Amino acid sequence: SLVNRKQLEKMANVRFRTQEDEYVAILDALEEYHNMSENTVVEKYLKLKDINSLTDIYIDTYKKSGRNKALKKFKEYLVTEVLELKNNNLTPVEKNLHFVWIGGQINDTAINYINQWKDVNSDYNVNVFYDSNAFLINTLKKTVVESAINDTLESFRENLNDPRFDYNKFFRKRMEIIYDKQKNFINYYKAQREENPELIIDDIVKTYLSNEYSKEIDELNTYIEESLNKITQNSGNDVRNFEEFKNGESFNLYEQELVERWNLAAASDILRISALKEIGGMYLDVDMLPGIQPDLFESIEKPSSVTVDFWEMTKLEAIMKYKEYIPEYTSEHFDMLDEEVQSSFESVLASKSDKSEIFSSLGDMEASPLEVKIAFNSKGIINQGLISVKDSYCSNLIVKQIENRYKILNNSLNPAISEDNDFNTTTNTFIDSIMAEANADNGRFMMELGKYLRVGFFPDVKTTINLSGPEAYAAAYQDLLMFKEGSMNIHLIEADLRNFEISKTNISQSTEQEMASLWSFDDARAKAQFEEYKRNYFEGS
Ligand SMILES: O=c1ccn([C@@H]2O[C@H](COP(=O)(O)OP(=O)(O)O[C@H]3O[C@H](CO)[C@@H](O)[C@H](O)[C@H]3F)[C@@H](O)[C@H]2O)c(=O)[nH]1
């Protein structure tokens, strides 16, 4: 399908101009590519990469050569050939569903979501990754942040009715206090981990909580017991036995997010891609649900006045209202429908007796050894769902993307922090360093890095996305299609990504749980929180 050698000598020549060694290198590599029946997909890709590099060498050596137009179209052909390679040679996806819940006890709602996948994919092995060393992180973060709420409001305990005490101001001051407490903990942690390098996270955490917040070690130990017991009874896989992950470059980043920043979503970001690289299968966030049988509601037309999203949520809410697969599932959106439409839902669902007629199964999936497939929503690609064969090329590209992004982050963050200054001063130093390194190829990314110290504690802070989330995936796909590594400026258009997207039929993303984020919160939510905190402080609690 890709042009052969003579087909390219035809594209590049003028009789008068000579054939240089830098051109013959291209010719030879192309000929070699067309004699690779003995080789694998990844080897074929690597050969296309060689070809592209040689072509770029020629174009950069003879800047105005008459060949350069032909060769520039040749490069387009190379990209096309990569996409053919991806699409025409697929291999079976390992039948594993990987979930992650780290930092604390797993909730019944998560289990109930997971159990639906179990119910309709009995041929799949299910893992729920947990960290047996770190059951107390969520308790630590909650204790600290609640103490901070209290100290803030006490500092403002006579301006509560002052309309100048905006939720914004509240979260700024609280952020100051959170930074101080959080650095206190981190320093204690590093010291203890110095005089005893094998102390586990939960030991240090529980003695910290005892010393500084009058918590009873006995109670925390009972909590640990109950969490271990619960996850063991629900397909748990201990991160502390995932040896390749522990021994790898990325484990320090996982523990940076887990222990220092208390961002379990980022830690899960770092773990999920390693699970796919080392094991293969499909990763799912615990607030995702199986796909709906495509023909189920084919008879119910969507009303003109409703968005596509709204309609999806109401599909699921109908399923749960009539079948009650998941208890206490909201009906907020379904209840807003015409009585006739609701009736239509009830009829269709009444005609069905078994869950297999509602939720579809994954079955025998296959994918390219080159690719990682990623879910998508109105907003763009989103790594709440992922599919990959073991050790796919893109899984390695993604691991590398994350590692480089954390290198850029920490080269500026760590010096700033080791100056033992307060939140605003540290922030200013760190931002100054990031700006000094910013340029045309990384601006967006660096701008988002400037907010890192606030993740999880302040409204509308989404740095994780650019560091360990979808932007690293997009960057990895661009790396693949540009025959390189280390892209920082994404120029792909949605059409480009569509080659790497998971079929919508394979996941139901518009779930109730999706709506509420565990690592981020928006302004309305921040305002509600502020008002409720004021009420609780007034009443003591
Ligand atoms: O206490 C906790 C709290 C959360 N987690 C993990 O974090 C995961 C993400 O939660 P969630 O839906 O809240 O994140 P989301 O809001 O969609 O953020 C996106 O972007 C995020 C970053 O890219 C990405 O993490 C996410 O997948 C995106 F869709 C959750 O499924 C667990 O694996 C945890 O392990 N322990």
Coordinates of C-alpha atoms and ligand atoms in Angstrom, one line a residue:
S1 CA 0.0 0.0 0.0
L2 CA 2.9 2.3 0.8
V3 CA 4.7 3.3 -2.4
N4 CA 7.7 1.1 -3.3
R5 CA 11.3 2.2 -4.2
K6 CA 10.8 2.9 -7.9
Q7 CA 7.4 4.5 -7.3
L8 CA 9.4 7.0 -5.2
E9 CA 12.3 7.5 -7.6
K10 CA 9.6 8.6 -10.0
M11 CA 8.3 11.1 -7.4
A12 CA 11.8 12.5 -6.8
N13 CA 14.1 13.5 -9.7
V14 CA 14.7 16.2 -12.4
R15 CA 17.3 14.3 -14.4
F16 CA 19.7 17.2 -13.9
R17 CA 20.1 16.9 -10.1
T18 CA 22.1 14.0 -8.7
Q19 CA 21.2 11.2 -6.3
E20 CA 22.9 11.7 -2.9
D21 CA 23.8 9.3 -0.2
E22 CA 21.1 10.9 2.0
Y23 CA 18.6 10.0 -0.7
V24 CA 19.8 6.5 -1.2
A25 CA 19.5 5.9 2.5
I26 CA 15.8 6.6 2.2
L27 CA 15.5 4.3 -0.9
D28 CA 17.2 1.4 0.8
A29 CA 15.2 1.7 4.0
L30 CA 12.0 1.7 2.0
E31 CA 13.0 -1.4 0.0
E32 CA 13.8 -3.0 3.3
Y33 CA 10.4 -2.1 4.7
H34 CA 8.7 -3.9 1.8
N35 CA 10.6 -7.1 2.7
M36 CA 9.5 -7.5 6.4
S37 CA 7.1 -10.4 6.2
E38 CA 9.3 -12.1 8.9
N39 CA 8.8 -9.1 11.3
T40 CA 6.2 -8.0 13.9
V41 CA 4.0 -4.9 13.8
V42 CA 6.2 -3.0 16.2
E43 CA 9.2 -3.8 14.1
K44 CA 7.4 -2.5 11.0
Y45 CA 6.6 0.7 12.9
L46 CA 10.2 1.1 14.0
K47 CA 11.2 0.8 10.3
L48 CA 8.8 3.5 9.3
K49 CA 10.3 5.6 12.0
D50 CA 13.8 5.1 10.6
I51 CA 12.5 6.0 7.1
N52 CA 10.9 9.2 8.4
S53 CA 14.1 10.2 10.2
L54 CA 16.2 9.7 7.1
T55 CA 13.7 11.7 5.0
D56 CA 13.8 14.6 7.5
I57 CA 17.6 14.5 7.3
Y58 CA 17.5 14.9 3.5
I59 CA 14.9 17.8 3.6
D60 CA 17.0 19.6 6.3
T61 CA 20.2 19.1 4.3
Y62 CA 19.0 20.3 0.9
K63 CA 16.5 23.0 2.0
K64 CA 15.3 24.0 -1.5
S65 CA 15.8 20.7 -3.3
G66 CA 13.1 20.0 -6.0
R67 CA 12.7 16.6 -4.3
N68 CA 11.4 18.2 -1.1
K69 CA 7.8 18.4 -2.3
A70 CA 7.7 14.7 -3.3
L71 CA 9.3 13.6 -0.1
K72 CA 7.0 15.9 1.9
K73 CA 4.1 14.0 0.4
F74 CA 6.0 10.8 1.2
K75 CA 5.8 11.7 4.9
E76 CA 2.1 12.0 4.7
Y77 CA 2.1 8.5 3.1
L78 CA 4.1 7.2 6.0
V79 CA 1.5 8.4 8.5
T80 CA -1.2 6.8 6.5
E81 CA 0.7 3.5 6.4
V82 CA 1.0 3.7 10.2
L83 CA -2.7 3.9 10.5
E84 CA -3.2 1.0 8.1
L85 CA -0.7 -1.0 10.2
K86 CA -2.7 -0.2 13.4
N87 CA -6.1 -1.1 11.9
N88 CA -5.4 -4.2 9.9
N89 CA -3.3 -6.2 12.4
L90 CA -5.1 -6.8 15.7
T91 CA -4.5 -9.3 18.5
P92 CA -6.7 -10.4 21.4
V93 CA -6.9 -8.1 24.4
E94 CA -6.2 -9.9 27.7
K95 CA -9.5 -10.4 29.5
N96 CA -8.8 -8.3 32.6
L97 CA -10.8 -5.5 34.1
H98 CA -8.6 -3.2 36.2
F99 CA -10.1 -0.9 38.8
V100 CA -8.2 1.2 41.3
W101 CA -9.2 2.3 44.8
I102 CA -6.3 3.6 47.0
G103 CA -6.0 5.8 50.0
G104 CA -8.9 4.5 52.2
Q105 CA -11.7 2.0 52.6
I106 CA -13.6 1.3 49.4
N107 CA -17.3 2.4 49.3
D108 CA -20.3 0.2 48.7
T109 CA -21.2 2.4 45.7
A110 CA -18.0 1.6 44.0
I111 CA -18.5 -2.1 44.7
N112 CA -22.0 -1.9 43.3
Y113 CA -20.8 -0.4 40.1
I114 CA -18.0 -3.0 39.8
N115 CA -20.5 -5.8 40.4
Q116 CA -22.4 -4.9 37.2
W117 CA -19.3 -5.4 35.1
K118 CA -18.8 -8.7 36.9
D119 CA -22.4 -9.8 36.3
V120 CA -22.2 -9.3 32.5
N121 CA -18.5 -10.3 32.0
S122 CA -18.1 -13.6 33.8
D123 CA -15.2 -14.6 31.5
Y124 CA -13.1 -11.6 32.7
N125 CA -10.7 -11.6 35.6
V126 CA -11.3 -8.5 37.8
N127 CA -8.7 -6.7 39.8
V128 CA -9.3 -3.9 42.3
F129 CA -5.9 -2.4 43.0
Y130 CA -5.3 -1.2 46.6
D131 CA -2.3 -0.2 48.6
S132 CA -2.1 -2.2 51.8
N133 CA 0.4 0.3 53.1
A134 CA -1.7 3.4 52.6
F135 CA -5.3 3.0 53.9
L136 CA -5.1 6.2 56.0
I137 CA -4.3 8.9 53.4
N138 CA -7.9 9.9 52.9
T139 CA -8.3 10.1 56.7
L140 CA -5.2 12.3 56.9
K141 CA -6.3 14.7 54.2
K142 CA -9.8 15.0 55.6
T143 CA -8.5 15.6 59.2
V144 CA -6.1 18.3 57.9
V145 CA -8.6 20.0 55.7
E146 CA -11.3 20.0 58.3
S147 CA -8.9 21.5 60.9
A148 CA -8.1 24.1 58.2
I149 CA -11.7 24.9 57.7
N150 CA -12.1 25.4 61.4
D151 CA -9.0 27.6 61.9
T152 CA -10.1 29.8 58.9
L153 CA -13.6 30.3 60.1
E154 CA -12.4 31.0 63.7
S155 CA -10.1 33.6 62.1
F156 CA -13.3 35.1 60.6
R157 CA -15.8 34.3 63.4
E158 CA -17.3 37.8 63.4
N159 CA -17.3 38.5 59.6
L160 CA -19.6 35.6 58.7
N161 CA -22.4 37.8 57.7
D162 CA -20.0 40.2 56.0
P163 CA -20.6 39.9 52.2
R164 CA -16.9 40.6 51.7
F165 CA -16.1 37.1 53.2
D166 CA -16.7 35.4 49.9
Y167 CA -16.3 31.7 49.3
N168 CA -13.3 32.7 47.2
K169 CA -11.6 34.5 50.1
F170 CA -12.4 31.6 52.4
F171 CA -10.6 29.1 50.1
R172 CA -7.6 31.4 49.7
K173 CA -7.0 31.7 53.4
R174 CA -7.8 28.0 54.0
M175 CA -5.3 27.2 51.3
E176 CA -2.6 29.1 53.2
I177 CA -3.4 27.0 56.3
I178 CA -3.5 23.7 54.4
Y179 CA -0.1 24.4 52.9
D180 CA 1.4 24.9 56.4
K181 CA -0.1 21.7 57.9
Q182 CA 0.7 19.7 54.8
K183 CA 4.3 20.7 54.8
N184 CA 4.5 19.9 58.5
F185 CA 3.3 16.3 57.7
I186 CA 5.6 15.9 54.7
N187 CA 8.7 17.0 56.8
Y188 CA 7.7 14.5 59.6
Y189 CA 7.4 11.8 56.9
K190 CA 10.8 12.4 55.4
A191 CA 12.4 12.5 58.8
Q192 CA 10.8 9.2 59.9
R193 CA 11.6 7.6 56.5
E194 CA 15.2 8.7 57.1
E195 CA 15.8 7.2 60.6
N196 CA 13.8 4.1 59.5
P197 CA 13.6 3.7 55.7
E198 CA 11.2 0.7 55.7
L199 CA 8.5 2.2 57.9
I200 CA 5.2 1.9 56.0
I201 CA 3.1 4.9 55.1
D202 CA 0.2 3.9 57.5
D203 CA 2.5 3.7 60.5
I204 CA 3.9 7.2 60.0
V205 CA 0.4 8.5 59.3
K206 CA -1.2 7.0 62.3
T207 CA 1.5 8.1 64.7
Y208 CA 1.3 11.6 63.1
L209 CA -2.5 11.7 63.6
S210 CA -2.0 10.6 67.2
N211 CA 0.7 13.2 68.0
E212 CA -1.0 16.1 66.4
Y213 CA -4.7 15.5 66.2
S214 CA -5.5 13.3 69.2
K215 CA -6.6 10.2 67.3
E216 CA -6.6 6.8 68.9
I217 CA -4.2 4.4 67.2
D218 CA -6.5 1.5 68.2
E219 CA -9.4 3.0 66.2
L220 CA -7.2 3.6 63.1
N221 CA -5.9 0.0 63.4
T222 CA -9.4 -1.3 63.5
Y223 CA -10.2 0.8 60.4
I224 CA -7.2 -0.7 58.6
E225 CA -8.3 -4.2 59.5
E226 CA -11.8 -3.6 58.2
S227 CA -10.6 -2.0 54.9
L228 CA -8.2 -4.9 54.2
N229 CA -11.0 -7.3 55.0
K230 CA -13.5 -5.6 52.7
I231 CA -11.2 -5.2 49.7
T232 CA -10.0 -8.8 50.1
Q233 CA -13.6 -9.9 49.7
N234 CA -13.9 -7.8 46.5
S235 CA -11.2 -8.9 44.2
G236 CA -8.4 -6.8 45.7
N237 CA -4.8 -6.8 44.2
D238 CA -2.1 -5.3 46.5
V239 CA 0.0 -2.7 44.8
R240 CA 2.8 -3.8 47.2
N241 CA 3.1 -7.1 45.2
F242 CA 3.0 -5.4 41.8
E243 CA 6.7 -5.8 41.6
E244 CA 7.5 -4.3 38.2
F245 CA 5.5 -1.1 39.2
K246 CA 7.3 -0.9 42.5
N247 CA 10.7 -1.3 40.9
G248 CA 10.1 1.2 38.1
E249 CA 10.9 4.9 37.5
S250 CA 7.2 5.9 38.0
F251 CA 6.8 4.5 41.6
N252 CA 8.4 7.7 43.0
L253 CA 5.7 9.7 41.2
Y254 CA 2.9 7.4 42.5
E255 CA 4.2 8.0 46.0
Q256 CA 4.7 11.7 45.5
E257 CA 1.0 12.0 44.7
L258 CA -0.1 9.5 47.3
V259 CA 1.9 10.6 50.4
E260 CA 2.8 14.3 49.7
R261 CA 0.0 15.8 47.6
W262 CA -2.9 13.5 48.7
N263 CA -4.2 13.2 45.2
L264 CA -5.5 9.7 44.8
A265 CA -6.7 10.4 41.2
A266 CA -3.2 11.3 40.1
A267 CA -1.7 8.2 41.8
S268 CA -4.4 6.1 40.1
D269 CA -3.4 7.8 36.8
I270 CA 0.2 6.6 37.3
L271 CA -0.9 3.1 38.3
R272 CA -3.4 2.4 35.6
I273 CA -1.0 2.8 32.7
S274 CA 1.5 0.5 34.3
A275 CA -1.2 -2.1 34.9
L276 CA -1.9 -1.9 31.1
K277 CA 1.7 -2.0 30.2
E278 CA 2.6 -5.0 32.4
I279 CA -0.7 -7.0 32.3
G280 CA -3.0 -5.9 29.5
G281 CA -6.7 -5.6 29.5
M282 CA -9.2 -2.8 30.1
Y283 CA -9.0 -0.1 32.8
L284 CA -12.2 1.4 34.2
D285 CA -12.8 4.1 36.8
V286 CA -15.1 2.8 39.5
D287 CA -17.9 5.3 38.5
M288 CA -18.2 3.7 35.1
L289 CA -20.9 1.2 34.1
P290 CA -21.2 -1.3 31.3
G291 CA -22.6 -0.3 27.9
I292 CA -26.3 -0.4 27.2
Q293 CA -27.5 -2.8 24.6
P294 CA -27.6 -0.7 21.4
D295 CA -31.1 -1.8 20.3
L296 CA -32.8 -1.5 23.8
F297 CA -34.3 2.0 23.5
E298 CA -34.2 2.2 19.7
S299 CA -38.0 2.7 19.9
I300 CA -37.8 5.8 22.1
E301 CA -37.1 9.0 20.2
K302 CA -35.1 11.7 22.0
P303 CA -37.2 14.8 22.8
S304 CA -36.2 17.9 20.9
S305 CA -35.8 19.9 24.1
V306 CA -33.2 17.6 25.8
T307 CA -29.5 17.4 25.3
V308 CA -27.7 14.2 24.3
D309 CA -26.0 14.0 27.7
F310 CA -29.2 14.5 29.7
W311 CA -30.8 11.8 27.5
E312 CA -27.9 9.3 28.4
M313 CA -28.3 10.0 32.1
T314 CA -32.0 9.4 31.8
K315 CA -31.4 6.1 30.0
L316 CA -29.4 4.8 33.0
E317 CA -31.8 6.4 35.6
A318 CA -34.7 4.5 33.9
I319 CA -32.8 1.2 34.0
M320 CA -32.2 1.7 37.7
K321 CA -35.7 2.9 38.5
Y322 CA -37.4 -0.1 37.0
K323 CA -34.7 -2.9 37.6
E324 CA -33.1 -1.4 40.7
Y325 CA -29.8 -3.1 39.9
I326 CA -28.1 -0.4 42.0
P327 CA -29.9 0.9 45.1
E328 CA -30.6 4.6 45.8
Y329 CA -29.8 5.6 42.3
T330 CA -31.0 9.1 41.3
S331 CA -34.1 9.7 39.2
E332 CA -33.5 13.4 39.0
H333 CA -33.4 13.7 35.2
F334 CA -35.8 10.8 34.3
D335 CA -38.5 12.5 36.5
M336 CA -38.3 15.6 34.3
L337 CA -39.6 13.7 31.2
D338 CA -43.1 13.8 29.8
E339 CA -45.4 11.2 31.4
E340 CA -45.7 9.6 27.9
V341 CA -42.0 9.3 27.5
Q342 CA -41.5 7.8 31.0
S343 CA -44.2 5.4 30.1
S344 CA -42.3 4.4 27.0
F345 CA -39.3 3.6 29.1
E346 CA -41.4 1.5 31.5
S347 CA -42.8 -0.5 28.6
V348 CA -39.5 -1.3 26.9
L349 CA -38.0 -2.3 30.2
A350 CA -41.0 -4.3 31.2
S351 CA -40.5 -6.4 28.0
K352 CA -37.1 -7.5 29.4
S353 CA -36.4 -10.2 32.1
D354 CA -32.6 -10.7 32.3
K355 CA -29.7 -8.2 32.8
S356 CA -28.0 -9.6 29.6
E357 CA -30.8 -7.8 27.6
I358 CA -30.0 -4.4 29.3
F359 CA -26.2 -4.3 29.6
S360 CA -24.0 -5.7 26.8
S361 CA -20.9 -7.7 27.3
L362 CA -17.3 -7.0 26.2
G363 CA -16.7 -10.5 24.7
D364 CA -13.6 -11.1 22.6
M365 CA -11.9 -7.7 22.1
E366 CA -8.8 -7.1 20.0
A367 CA -6.5 -4.2 19.4
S368 CA -3.2 -3.2 17.7
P369 CA 0.1 -3.9 19.5
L370 CA 0.8 -0.2 18.7
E371 CA -2.1 1.4 20.4
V372 CA -3.9 2.2 23.7
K373 CA -7.6 3.0 23.1
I374 CA -9.2 5.7 25.3
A375 CA -12.7 6.7 26.0
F376 CA -14.1 10.1 25.0
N377 CA -16.9 12.5 25.9
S378 CA -18.2 15.9 24.7
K379 CA -15.1 17.4 26.3
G380 CA -12.6 15.2 24.4
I381 CA -10.7 12.0 25.1
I382 CA -10.7 10.9 28.8
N383 CA -8.8 8.1 30.5
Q384 CA -11.7 7.0 32.7
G385 CA -11.7 4.0 30.3
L386 CA -8.7 2.4 28.5
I387 CA -8.0 -0.7 26.5
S388 CA -4.6 -2.1 25.6
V389 CA -2.8 -5.4 24.9
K390 CA 0.1 -6.2 27.2
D391 CA 3.1 -3.9 26.5
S392 CA 1.6 -2.0 23.6
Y393 CA 3.9 0.6 22.1
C394 CA 1.6 3.4 23.1
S395 CA 1.5 2.3 26.7
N396 CA 5.3 2.8 26.8
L397 CA 5.0 6.1 25.0
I398 CA 2.5 7.2 27.6
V399 CA 4.6 6.1 30.6
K400 CA 7.5 8.1 29.1
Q401 CA 5.2 11.2 28.6
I402 CA 4.2 11.1 32.2
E403 CA 7.8 10.7 33.4
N404 CA 9.0 13.7 31.3
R405 CA 6.1 15.9 32.5
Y406 CA 6.9 15.1 36.1
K407 CA 10.6 15.9 35.5
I408 CA 9.7 19.3 34.2
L409 CA 7.4 19.8 37.2
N410 CA 9.8 18.7 39.9
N411 CA 12.9 20.6 38.5
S412 CA 11.0 23.8 39.3
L413 CA 8.9 22.7 42.3
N414 CA 11.5 21.0 44.4
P415 CA 13.9 24.0 44.7
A416 CA 11.0 26.4 45.4
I417 CA 9.9 24.1 48.2
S418 CA 13.2 23.5 49.8
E419 CA 13.2 27.3 50.6
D420 CA 11.3 27.0 53.8
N421 CA 8.8 29.7 52.9
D422 CA 5.0 30.1 53.2
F423 CA 2.3 29.3 50.6
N424 CA 2.3 32.6 48.7
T425 CA 6.1 33.0 48.6
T426 CA 6.6 29.3 47.5
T427 CA 3.9 29.8 44.9
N428 CA 5.6 32.9 43.5
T429 CA 9.0 31.2 43.4
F430 CA 7.6 28.1 41.6
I431 CA 5.6 30.2 39.1
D432 CA 8.6 32.3 38.4
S433 CA 10.7 29.2 37.6
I434 CA 8.0 27.7 35.4
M435 CA 7.6 30.9 33.4
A436 CA 11.4 31.2 32.9
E437 CA 11.3 27.8 31.3
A438 CA 8.1 28.4 29.3
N439 CA 8.2 28.8 25.5
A440 CA 6.2 28.3 22.3
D441 CA 6.3 24.5 22.5
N442 CA 5.0 24.1 26.1
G443 CA 3.0 27.2 27.1
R444 CA -0.4 25.6 27.8
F445 CA 1.2 22.8 29.8
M446 CA 3.4 25.1 31.9
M447 CA 0.5 27.5 32.6
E448 CA -1.4 24.5 34.0
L449 CA 1.7 23.4 36.0
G450 CA 1.7 26.7 37.8
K451 CA -1.4 25.6 39.8
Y452 CA 0.0 22.3 41.1
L453 CA 0.2 23.2 44.8
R454 CA -3.5 23.8 44.9
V455 CA -4.8 20.5 43.4
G456 CA -7.7 19.1 45.5
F457 CA -7.9 22.2 47.8
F458 CA -9.2 25.0 45.6
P459 CA -12.0 25.3 42.9
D460 CA -11.2 24.7 39.3
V461 CA -7.7 23.4 39.6
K462 CA -7.2 20.7 36.9
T463 CA -3.4 20.3 36.7
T464 CA -3.7 16.5 36.9
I465 CA -5.2 16.4 33.4
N466 CA -2.0 17.8 31.9
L467 CA 0.4 15.8 34.0
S468 CA -0.9 12.3 34.2
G469 CA -4.2 12.5 32.5
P470 CA -5.6 12.8 28.9
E471 CA -3.1 15.4 27.6
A472 CA -0.3 12.8 28.1
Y473 CA -2.3 10.3 26.0
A474 CA -2.9 12.9 23.2
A475 CA 0.8 13.7 23.3
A476 CA 1.7 10.0 23.1
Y477 CA -0.6 9.5 20.0
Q478 CA 1.1 12.5 18.4
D479 CA 4.5 11.0 19.2
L480 CA 3.3 7.8 17.4
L481 CA 2.1 9.7 14.3
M482 CA 5.2 12.0 14.3
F483 CA 7.7 9.1 14.6
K484 CA 9.2 10.7 17.7
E485 CA 9.0 11.0 21.5
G486 CA 8.5 13.9 23.8
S487 CA 5.7 16.0 22.1
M488 CA 4.7 18.9 24.4
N489 CA 2.5 20.9 21.9
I490 CA -0.5 18.9 20.7
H491 CA -1.7 19.8 17.2
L492 CA -3.9 16.8 16.5
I493 CA -7.5 17.4 15.6
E494 CA -10.4 15.3 16.9
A495 CA -10.5 13.3 13.7
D496 CA -6.9 12.2 14.4
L497 CA -7.9 10.9 17.8
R498 CA -10.9 9.1 16.6
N499 CA -8.6 6.3 15.4
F500 CA -7.8 5.7 19.0
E501 CA -11.2 6.0 20.7
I502 CA -13.2 3.3 22.4
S503 CA -16.7 2.6 20.9
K504 CA -19.3 4.3 22.9
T505 CA -21.2 1.0 23.1
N506 CA -18.5 -0.4 25.4
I507 CA -19.0 2.0 28.4
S508 CA -21.8 4.0 30.0
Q509 CA -20.0 7.1 31.1
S510 CA -23.0 9.3 32.0
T511 CA -23.4 7.7 35.4
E512 CA -24.6 9.4 38.6
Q513 CA -21.1 9.0 40.2
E514 CA -19.3 10.6 37.3
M515 CA -21.0 14.0 38.0
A516 CA -19.1 14.4 41.3
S517 CA -15.4 14.6 41.1
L518 CA -13.1 13.1 43.8
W519 CA -10.0 15.2 43.1
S520 CA -11.6 18.5 41.8
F521 CA -14.6 20.7 42.4
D522 CA -16.1 23.7 40.6
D523 CA -17.3 27.1 41.8
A524 CA -20.9 26.2 42.6
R525 CA -19.8 23.2 44.6
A526 CA -17.2 25.4 46.4
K527 CA -19.9 28.0 47.3
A528 CA -22.3 25.3 48.7
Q529 CA -19.4 23.9 50.7
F530 CA -18.5 27.3 52.1
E531 CA -22.1 28.0 53.2
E532 CA -22.5 24.6 54.8
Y533 CA -19.2 25.0 56.6
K534 CA -20.3 28.3 58.1
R535 CA -23.5 26.6 59.3
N536 CA -21.6 23.7 60.9
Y537 CA -19.2 26.1 62.6
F538 CA -22.0 28.2 64.0
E539 CA -23.6 25.1 65.5
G540 CA -20.3 23.7 66.7
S541 CA -20.0 20.6 64.6
Ligands
LIG1 O1 -9.8 8.2 47.2 C1 -9.7 8.0 46.2 C2 -10.3 8.9 45.2 C3 -10.1 8.6 43.8 N1 -9.4 7.4 43.4 C4 -9.3 7.2 42.0 O2 -9.4 8.2 41.3 C5 -10.2 7.9 40.1 C6 -10.9 9.0 39.5 O3 -12.0 9.5 40.0 P1 -13.1 10.4 39.2 O4 -14.1 10.1 38.4 O5 -13.4 11.1 40.3 O6 -12.2 11.4 38.5 P2 -12.7 12.4 37.3 O7 -13.5 13.3 38.0 O8 -13.5 11.8 36.4 O9 -11.4 13.0 36.6 C7 -10.8 12.7 35.4 O10 -9.3 13.1 35.2 C8 -8.4 12.5 36.2 C9 -7.1 12.8 36.0 O11 -6.8 12.6 34.7 C10 -8.4 11.0 36.1 O12 -7.8 10.6 37.3 C11 -9.8 10.5 35.9 O13 -9.7 9.1 35.5 C12 -10.5 11.3 34.9 F1 -11.8 10.8 34.3 C13 -11.1 6.8 40.8 O14 -11.8 6.0 39.8 C14 -10.3 6.1 41.5 O15 -9.3 5.2 40.8 C15 -8.9 6.6 44.3 O16 -8.4 5.7 44.0 N2 -9.1 6.9 45.7

